[PDB]
Amino acid sequence: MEAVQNRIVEAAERVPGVRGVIHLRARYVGQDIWADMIIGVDPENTVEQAHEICEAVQAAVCGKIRRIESLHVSAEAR
Amino acid sequence: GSHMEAVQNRIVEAAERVPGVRGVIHLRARYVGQDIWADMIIGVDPENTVEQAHEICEAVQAAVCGKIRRIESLHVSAEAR
């Protein structure tokens, strides 16, 4: 499952605001994926702003990788 | 159980008296052998920086982990409130 994580990470890295993927845990349950992602972000963004980035990553990542059934994202400094 | 309820009321109470914290939003704590692994989420001013939020978080960690020594691991994170 490493083209997929690669897919996910890349979908992540392209979203406006995302400084990098700090961490990903993705598992298959059947053929769906469930995953939890920690993105890196600009430390001078706000908590509000960082949350808006997390949302964006989620829509984008779940949109591009359709087999993901459930995805959580959080944000941290760079 | 009631001892874990006691320990949690203590985790909340330590974290809640760090300036910066607008509340405990969530707290999971469980024994892994004889120590606690907890993961918690603190409420913070939305207009705080990420860098700042992390400073509140790190400081909650220090307070909680120093007052409750049972705890071998604690991960703190901020969200708005």
Author numbering:
A (entry chain C): 214 to 291
B (entry chain A): 211 to 291
Quote what the paper states about this structure.
One group of metal ion efflux transporters that regulates metal ion homeostasis and can be found in all domains of life is the Cation Diffusion Facilitator (CDF) protein family. One of the most highly conserved and abundant integral MM proteins is the CDF transporter MamM. MamM was recently proposed to function as a magnetosome-directed iron transporter required for iron biomineralization since its deletion abolished magnetite biomineralization and mutation of residues within the conserved TMD metal-binding site resulted in alterations of magnetite crystal size, morphology and even mineral phase. To summarize our results we present an alternative model for the CDF CTD mode of action, in which we propose that upon metal cation binding, the CTD induces conformational changes towards a tighter and more compact fold which allows the activation of iron transport through the TMD.
